[PDB]
Amino acid sequence: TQELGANFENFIGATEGFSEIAYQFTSHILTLGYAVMLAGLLYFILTIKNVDKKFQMSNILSAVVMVSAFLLLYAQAQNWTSSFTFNEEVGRYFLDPSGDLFNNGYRYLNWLIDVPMLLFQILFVVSLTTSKFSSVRNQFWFSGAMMIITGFIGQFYEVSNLTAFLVWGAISSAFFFHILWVMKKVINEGKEGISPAGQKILSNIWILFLISWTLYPGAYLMPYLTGVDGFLYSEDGVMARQLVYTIADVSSKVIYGVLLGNLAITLSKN
């Protein structure tokens, strides 16, 4: 009965501890994460005049997303280093009873805030054809909120009840597939009535969206992708999970935002 270690990170940190490499790599990847958001924030502020007025809500939403992600990923980065402390006799980092313990709340809150804005912002760059703005918006927001809420419920049970962790994750995946379906419709309608250069950027946005958003359930399942007591059921699964989350964050937020800005610029060229 391991009482101190909630989530898989605390469980590993309370039982086997983290190697110096695992601890430092995770710290550095999380720091790179918030550093890139700060850089993106300055980018989306400074380039806002490069797009026509009618598209600027997309730049605005990118910047607000950068603020939320910078703040919350900074908090998560400090939560990592504060939750695990070095033991000299073993030579590894263990869960620190005097710390606050690692907490996925920061990242999940960031998702709850950012998912609706990221889905919303494309609607200020492309034009729909036969779909209604309000209908697409409401579907994005409802399914986006439900995907994050049900995923957050599942993640509590990650250590204590693997069955609940997977079932809630499956429910969350149902809302995710709904979002993918709606976004593909948005991309297709967005391609109608624009230049071939604009259509090519939208093609790339779809691939970037599909890959980067699918990385999140992949990192959710990461500790179990090689089975209980498998190679990933260890600090290596923690490292891979946090690496994939950070890649996903930079791609789904920053790169996505840059591509939408590039689309908005191209649309003014006709």
Ligand X SMILES: CCCCCCCCCCCCCCCCCCCC
Please report whether residue 197 would count as binding ligand X according to CB under 6 A: no
Q: How far is CA 99 from the centre of its chain?
A: 25
Cα-Cα end-to-end distance for the chain:
66
Please report whether residue 239 would count as binding ligand X according to CB under 6 A: no
* Segment interacting with ligand RET, rule: CB under 6 A, options 42-50, 83-91, 124-132, 171-179: 171-179
* 3-state DSSP of 172-191: HHHHHHHHHHHHHHHHHHHH
* Segment interacting with Na ion, rule: CB under 5 A, options 74-82, 129-137, 189-197, 202-210: 74-82
Q: Which is nearer to ligand X, 43 or 84 (CB)?
A: 43
Please report whether residue 81 would count as binding Na ion according to CB under 5 A: yes
Query: Which residues are CB-neighbours of 218 under 8 A, at least 6 positions away?
Result: 225, 244
List the one residue from 1, 46, 97, 269 that touches ligand X (CB under 6 A): 46
Name the nearest CA neighbour of 150 among 122, 183, 177, 172: 172
User: Minimum distance between the CB of residue 215 and ligand X, rounded to whole angstroms?
Assistant: 5
Query: Which residues are CB-neighbours of 85 under 8 A, at least 6 positions away?
Result: 93, 94, 96, 99
Q: Which is nearer to ligand X, 22 or 37 (CB)?
A: 37
User: Minimum distance between the CB of residue 223 and Na ion, rounded to whole angstroms?
Assistant: 21
Query: Which residues are CB-neighbours of 234 under 8 A, at least 6 positions away?
Result: 12, 16, 223
Q: Which is nearer to ligand RET, 128 or 208 (CB)?
A: 208
* Segment interacting with ligand X, rule: CB under 6 A, options 8-16, 95-103, 157-165, 181-189: 157-165
Q: Which is nearer to Na ion, 91 or 230 (CB)?
A: 91
List the one residue from 13, 17, 33, 169 that touches ligand RET (CB under 6 A): 169
Q: Which is nearer to ligand X, 75 or 244 (CB)?
A: 244
Please report whether residue 217 would count as binding ligand RET according to CB under 6 A: yes
Q: What is the DSSP letter of 218?
A: H
At residue 231, the 3 state secondary structure works out as coil
Please report whether residue 140 would count as binding ligand RET according to CB under 6 A: no
On the CB side of 63, CA atoms within 13 Å amount to 12
Question: Which residues make beta-bridge pairs with 54?
Answer: none
Please report whether residue 27 would count as binding Na ion according to CB under 5 A: no
On the CB side of 68, CA atoms within 13 Å amount to 22
Query: Which residues are CB-neighbours of 34 under 8 A, at least 6 positions away?
Result: 69, 70, 73, 74, 76, 77
Which entry of Na ion, ligand RET, ligand X, none binds 216, CB below 5 to 8 A by partner kind? ligand RET
Q: Which is nearer to Na ion, 31 or 85 (CB)?
A: 85
Residues within the interface to ligand X (CB under 6 A)? 31, 35-36, 38-40, 42-43, 46-47, 50, 112-113, 116-117, 161, 163-164, 167, 204, 207-208, 210-212, 214-215, 218, 244, 247, 250-251, 254-255, 258, 262
